[PDB]
Amino acid sequence: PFGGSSHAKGIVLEKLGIESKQPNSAIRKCVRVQLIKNGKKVTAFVPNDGCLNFVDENDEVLLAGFGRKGKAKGDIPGVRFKVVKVSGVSLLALWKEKKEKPR
Amino acid sequence: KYTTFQGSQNFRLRIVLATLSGKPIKIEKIRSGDLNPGLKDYEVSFLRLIESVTNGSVIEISYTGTTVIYRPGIIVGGASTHICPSSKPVGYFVEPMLYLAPFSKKKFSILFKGITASHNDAGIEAIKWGLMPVMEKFGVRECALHTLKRGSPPLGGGEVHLVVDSLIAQPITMHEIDRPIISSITGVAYSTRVSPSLVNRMIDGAKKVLKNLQCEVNITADVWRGENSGKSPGWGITLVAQSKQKGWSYFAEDIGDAGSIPEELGEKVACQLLEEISKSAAVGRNQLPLAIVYMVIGKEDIGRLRINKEQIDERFIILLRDIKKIFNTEVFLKPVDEADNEDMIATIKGIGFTNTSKKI
Amino acid sequence: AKLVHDVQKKQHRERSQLTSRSRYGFLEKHKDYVKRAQDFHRKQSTLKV
Amino acid sequence: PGKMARTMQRSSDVNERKLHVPMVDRTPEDDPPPFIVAVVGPPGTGKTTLIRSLVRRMTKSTLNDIQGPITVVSGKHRRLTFLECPADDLNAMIDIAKIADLVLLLIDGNFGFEMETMEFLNIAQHHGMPRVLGVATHLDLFKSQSTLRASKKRLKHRFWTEVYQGAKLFYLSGVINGRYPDREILNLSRFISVMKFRPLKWRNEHPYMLADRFTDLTHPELIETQGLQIDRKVAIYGYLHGTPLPSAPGTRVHIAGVGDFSVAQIEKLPDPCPTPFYQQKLDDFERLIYAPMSDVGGVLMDKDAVYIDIGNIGKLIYMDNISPEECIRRWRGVDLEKFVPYFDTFEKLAKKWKSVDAIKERFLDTWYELQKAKISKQLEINNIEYQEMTPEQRQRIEGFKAGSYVRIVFEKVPMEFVKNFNPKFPIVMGGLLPTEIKFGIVKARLRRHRWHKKILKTNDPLVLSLGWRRFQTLPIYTTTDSRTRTRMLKYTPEHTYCNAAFYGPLCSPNTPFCGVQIVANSDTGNGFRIAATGIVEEIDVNIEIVKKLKLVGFPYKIFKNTAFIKDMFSSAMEVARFEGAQIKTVSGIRGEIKRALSKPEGHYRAAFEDKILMSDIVILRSWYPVRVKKFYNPVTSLLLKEKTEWKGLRLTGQIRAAMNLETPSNPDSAYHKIERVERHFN
Amino acid sequence: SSFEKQQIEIRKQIEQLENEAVAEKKWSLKGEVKAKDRPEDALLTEELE
RNA sequence: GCUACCACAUCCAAGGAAGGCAGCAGGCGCGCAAAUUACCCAAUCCUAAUUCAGGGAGGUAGUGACAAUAAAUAACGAUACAGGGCCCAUUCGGGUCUUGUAAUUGGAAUGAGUACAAUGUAAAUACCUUAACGAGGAACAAUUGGAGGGCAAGUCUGGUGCCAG
Ligand SMILES: Nc1nc2c(ncn2[C@@H]2O[C@H](COP(=O)(O)OP(=O)(O)OP(=O)(O)O)[C@@H](O)[C@H]2O)c(=O)[nH]1
Numbered sequence A: 001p002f003g004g005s006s007h008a009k010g011i012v013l014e015k016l017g018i019e020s021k022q023p024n025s026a027i028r029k030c031v032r033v034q035l036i037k038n039g040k041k042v043t044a045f046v047p048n049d050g051c052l053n054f055v056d057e058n059d060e061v062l063l064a065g066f067g068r069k070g071k072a073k074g075d076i077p078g079v080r081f082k083v084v085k086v087s088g089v090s091l092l093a094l095w096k097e098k099k100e101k102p103r
Numbered sequence B: 001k002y003t004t005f006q007g008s009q010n011f012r013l014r015i016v017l018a019t020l021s022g023k024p025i026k027i028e029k030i031r032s033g034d035l036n037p038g039l040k041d042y043e044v045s046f047l048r049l050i051e052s053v054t055n056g057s058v059i060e061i062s063y064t065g066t067t068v069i070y071r072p073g074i075i076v077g078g079a080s081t082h083i084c085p086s087s088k089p090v091g092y093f094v095e096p097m098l099y100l101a102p103f104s105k106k107k108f109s110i111l112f113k114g115i116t117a118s119h120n121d122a123g124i125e126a127i128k129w130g131l132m133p134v135m136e137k138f139g140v141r142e143c144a145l146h147t148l149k150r151g152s153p154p155l156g157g158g159e160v161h162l163v164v165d166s167l168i169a170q171p172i173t174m175h176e177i178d179r180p181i182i183s184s185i186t187g188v189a190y191s192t193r194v195s196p197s198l199v200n201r202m203i204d205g206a207k208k209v210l211k212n213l214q215c216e217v218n219i220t221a222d223v224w225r226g227e228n229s230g231k232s233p234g235w236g237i238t239l240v241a242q243s244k245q246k247g248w249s250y251f252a253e254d255i256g257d258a259g260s261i262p263e264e265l266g267e268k269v270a271c272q273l274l275e276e277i278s279k280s281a282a283v284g285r286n287q288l289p290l291a292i293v294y295m296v297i298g299k300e301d302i303g304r305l306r307i308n309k310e311q312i313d314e315r316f317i318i319l320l321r322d323i324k325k326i327f328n329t330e331v332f333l334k335p336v337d338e339a340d341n342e343d344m345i346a347t348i349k350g351i352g353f354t355n356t357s358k359k360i
Numbered sequence C: 001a002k003l004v005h006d007v008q009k010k011q012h013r014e015r016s017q018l019t020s021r022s023r024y025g026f027l028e029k030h031k032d033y034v035k036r037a038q039d040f041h042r043k044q045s046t047l048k049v
Numbered sequence D: 001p002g003k004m005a006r007t008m009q010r011s012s013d014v015n016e017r018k019l020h021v022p023m024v025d026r027t028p029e030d031d032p033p034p035f036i037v038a039v040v041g042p043p044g045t046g047k048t049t050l051i052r053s054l055v056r057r058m059t060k061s062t063l064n065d066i067q068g069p070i071t072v073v074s075g076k077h078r079r080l081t082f083l084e085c086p087a088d089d090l091n092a093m094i095d096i097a098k099i100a101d102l103v104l105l106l107i108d109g110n111f112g113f114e115m116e117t118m119e120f121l122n123i124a125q126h127h128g129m130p131r132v133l134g135v136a137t138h139l140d141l142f143k144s145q146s147t148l149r150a151s152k153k154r155l156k157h158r159f160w161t162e163v164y165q166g167a168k169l170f171y172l173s174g175v176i177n178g179r180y181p182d183r184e185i186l187n188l189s190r191f192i193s194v195m196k197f198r199p200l201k202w203r204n205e206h207p208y209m210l211a212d213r214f215t216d217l218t219h220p221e222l223i224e225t226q227g228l229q230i231d232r233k234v235a236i237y238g239y240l241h242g243t244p245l246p247s248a249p250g251t252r253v254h255i256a257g258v259g260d261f262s263v264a265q266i267e268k269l270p271d272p273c274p275t276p277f278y279q280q281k282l283d284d285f286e287r288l289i290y291a292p293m294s295d296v297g298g299v300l301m302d303k304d305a306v307y308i309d310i311g312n313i314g315k316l317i318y319m320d321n322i323s324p325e326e327c328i329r330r331w332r333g334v335d336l337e338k339f340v341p342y343f344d345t346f347e348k349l350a351k352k353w354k355s356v357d358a359i360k361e362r363f364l365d366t367w368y369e370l371q372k373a374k375i376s377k378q379l380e381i382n383n384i385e386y387q388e389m390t391p392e393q394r395q396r397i398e399g400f401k402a403g404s405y406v407r408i409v410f411e412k413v414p415m416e417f418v419k420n421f422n423p424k425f426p427i428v429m430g431g432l433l434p435t436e437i438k439f440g441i442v443k444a445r446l447r448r449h450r451w452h453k454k455i456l457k458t459n460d461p462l463v464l465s466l467g468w469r470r471f472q473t474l475p476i477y478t479t480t481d482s483r484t485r486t487r488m489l490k491y492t493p494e495h496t497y498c499n500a501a502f503y504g505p506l507c508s509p510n511t512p513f514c515g516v517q518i519v520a521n522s523d524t525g526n527g528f529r530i531a532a533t534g535i536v537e538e539i540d541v542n543i544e545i546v547k548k549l550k551l552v553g554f555p556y557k558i559f560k561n562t563a564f565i566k567d568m569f570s571s572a573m574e575v576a577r578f579e580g581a582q583i584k585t586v587s588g589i590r591g592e593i594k595r596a597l598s599k600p601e602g603h604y605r606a607a608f609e610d611k612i613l614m615s616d617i618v619i620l621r622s623w624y625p626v627r628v629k630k631f632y633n634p635v636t637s638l639l640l641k642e643k644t645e646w647k648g649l650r651l652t653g654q655i656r657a658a659m660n661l662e663t664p665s666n667p668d669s670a671y672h673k674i675e676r677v678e679r680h681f682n
Numbered sequence E: 001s002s003f004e005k006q007q008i009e010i011r012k013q014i015e016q017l018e019n020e021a022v023a024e025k026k027w028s029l030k031g032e033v034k035a036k037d038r039p040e041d042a043l044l045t046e047e048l049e
Numbered sequence F: 001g002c003u004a005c006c007a008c009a010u011c012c013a014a015g016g017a018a019g020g021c022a023g024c025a026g027g028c029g030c031g032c033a034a035a036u037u038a039c040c041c042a043a044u045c046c047u048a049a050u051u052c053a054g055g056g057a058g059g060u061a062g063u064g065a066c067a068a069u070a071a072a073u074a075a076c077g078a079u080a081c082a083g084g085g086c087c088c089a090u091u092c093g094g095g096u097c098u099u100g101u102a103a104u105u106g107g108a109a110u111g112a113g114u115a116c117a118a119u120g121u122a123a124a125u126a127c128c129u130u131a132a133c134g135a136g137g138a139a140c141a142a143u144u145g146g147a148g149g150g151c152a153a154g155u156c157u158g159g160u161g162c163c164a165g
């Protein structure tokens, strides 16, 4: 995918489609991160627009492959990474209110 | 109200420094010993422009008109339209927005209406090819200036459109210590409601003066046919010399007087360009305060720029005194080692500045 | 489900008729109106026929 | 083969673990300041005895009566400023959370993980987590070693949930002789002597200090004639961290919990606790602890008494008197509104420029490591052009770089501060910007904290730590209706983020801040005290912010598709203001208001898309603008005498309770249970 | 002292905001405004979209 | 260990004087991450002038979801009230039957745990034993995932009314 590893570190650069209207959509769950191994920008989902409110900017996320099973109605074909960790802590723990985001 | 200046010295520069600092200023004794003592119409309209692009900025003018209190706000910007008074052209009404543009909360799309040429201030093609590359070197990316209709003195009717998009956090500190190899010389001669023969006579005089060199020399012809020509007729010429490798450019320009010879105008502009290159060191003598104030507001770091002993003059001194008074910053000046010239490296500790007005 | 809390699946309750209009009983919501319009259009269709 | 492929995958994964985000270091490589270590714990966990044992081992000095910050030497290049924070003062905890770099978190063993420990963990985690290090005391009280090891393992794993996993914590056994076991203290001290720190943004962008020594400078006869109410001139002694403080008098710094001052004078002083290599180079070019506020040796200074145990073109330019024409005359031997520069006449320029030779002379792998190499290159260029000129540059234009003793004298300092100052509490000095001296309204995004029970209310006070200041405000909690408006809410949601807007001093965007409720030790109770957390997103001087009101009217004469509504407005002039407008019913059907009526005063006719009934209610949605109240109230707790139970604005529930009122209510708004009947038409 | 004066004026503002937050709500800062609740012609005095 | 010559390197009163283990534990090597600077020579041996002294050799504990083995978090009743419950089909539909309830209630059994204790041991820890306490849901409050629905005087968008998303 991005070369060697299974997971790839990257810097959150901007937040695509924050200005969309209908909440919890593909362009609202998409962000854009630049991989630090190449200095190369590429777009990537987060689950759950709440977790979009978690990840902010210049914040050292860790992506993984997305892995869709079947095609959906409104999903964007082409984005291939999701965000797993944000600055060391995991987005599922932040979402389920186990941990906090340290800075 | 707190930092106090005197006279009508450096009005737009002092306004820009007040806005970029955040320190409230008061300029007193403005044109005291005159028969219409006080401000000017272009001065008060420039203050109107500043109040229109900022937010929460209190400007008050004394009833005598010789004391201006400025308390600066934050820089919103946006899209607007300024009808400049006819006493001064839109180059004079634009250059402070070149200082203040890419450090704002919104992008800059301003439409200026008025005269677009004078012997005093900056022409539109001059300000583009001369002041835009300094900013594009200092790290703003998508900036431009369109010319919808182009005026001429003393009637104008010219419309320019300033559009600046890249809102950067602070300008990257520059390290230029060399003398750029000039690649080529290009230029452009424009004319409103006069003849293509006059345009070709200008460019012929220019090439006749510049024929003694070896580099490539090209000047374009720009007649303005039709509704985009303004009211009054006139002409002018602008010449730039480009260093293609580092992307630098020096420039000189002038317009045509009411009854002058276009070949003599071309000779004057070509000789002024060559004199500017002779008195140049990595910058132009008219570009210098822009790069100086940008290196000042660059981040907390020493920045280095090679300038010339001849380029040191009266206005350089008064600019450095104004900067020392507002930002509390000094320019250290070390002479370069090489003895065929007397260039001075200017090192400025760019103070900690951030584009704190932006939205995330 | 998938990535939705229960507080996200909250169940908002519904408001009743304002007290001063208890004569004109039972404020009608969208379900009641859609019953009304369905039946009226059935009657009008057979009348047109 | 397979071994090559599996070690290829493993090496790839560990490389992509080692990559990072580039940050600028901003610390002096030459003479770095003492790292600050802060002992935090509940009010019984023995932190005086810990600090005493650690000093006694570190320097072989029995040191009674610890009060105020205390710097000792360690190793060949380190110094440690130990600081005790009190456990009754949430303001003290907040200041320590902003300043500290290593946090010794001491927690009880027989009693498990008190709320103050949890609170400090969360406020430090919000304002940027420094290197934290747990120690666990009181382990002698455990009867059985099964209970002891169970407690050890449970504290260990809860701590690993809090901090990174494997954050080791040190177990201190007994407080035998006013000190701890020397073996465990040696291990602790070796660990904090080989601790390694990381770059943080607030430290590496702001110039700050923690004041060691403290004195006021006023005439006694001035005090006598003015009558003790006069603002007193006060000097401040201490170190310097973070960012070069500018050497020009006239700056703005915040003394935390006091106010907001420009300095009056600044003077660099050489350190009384110097580095061993500093003293080595000092003796070479010529040919132990420091603790003012506490005891040292056997002597303690009072206010005035003592207590002892029983036994050149640049300078021509920057000169201001000289006219610039005289300056250029001296250097050799107008305005700027004319953007064209001065030139020479045309015939002279042409005659000079017949020749072109004098100007024909001038004519013709990993991206992280790349960025960090660029930062390093800029740092070394900074270094060498600093080294170029010693008396001009590093004195004046570079400011006073970190790691230098400084004395700073102020004016306008309160009598309450000077009188009621007791040296157990710290005094932090942070260097503000003009952006942090100006004011406006800030737009943040925030949630109610996950361990706080009650949700926060709109227009209800909230003390918050943002920047250096700790000020109390009235926020307003807003949402944006799917990115169209900014409608206000009446409460914050319980498990997500809402926007907030509030008056107060401005700070840079992307700045994390943390707000608490009631901050009095006489009001703590047993609930978690941290209330909201978030980041300030943007700055303005004015936001538009909207509350929805819906005009409600009832129909009183219905027809097919047309009704006369009766109760929304009062006058035909009002309806004529509002006519042609868009209304709906409770029942869902749309319609417009079309014309005013004449014989009744506020009645109008409206056309709907189906036959409205009599039982229904028409409504008109409308957007009234609300405005943000301009309350601003800093704490000034150590200006106060007791320095706890600072009480500002009360909450709404407590106001109603103290004034003996009751909660408002609408019985036509409380919900009920509906059992409607199956309906049959003719 | 100056701090005493400053805390006096802030105590005054405290009392004012307490009385405001305990007192009754403005007709426009309710919801569901009716003509019997708002003042007469106040909707022409005001300005809302 | 000694003597030269190379290289770092320590103290001083300036004449002079001294210096080098990833064996055992504990660190640094990134700014982002992991077992104690514990106990003993009681076993196994070895060394001596030798029964007795010594031995980070070896042994004993502490640490942890790398792996590996065994198995708790409940069992047995007694009611009360209801009439529907489950299976198959692309369609009409077909097949079968004491089932359903956050509804009441009774005593019994027990170890996680806390410990008189004794055993274990160089001395302890753990295990194996056993007096005393120790079970009714907030007690003694097991997880991690996956498939569905519908609710508002809520918001947003498209439209050939009342619809669609
Ligand atoms: N039994 C026992 N007592 C301890 C232990 N550690 C501390 N203490 C007791 O705690 C007291 C020391 O208090 P401090 O260490 O000053 O507590 P502090 O919170 O740091 O400061 P203060 O609140 O001012 O006491 C002594 O009187 C000790 O008896 C421990 O490990 N075991």
Ligand SMILES: [Mg+2]
Binding pocket: D047, D048, D049
């Ligand atoms: Mg104490």
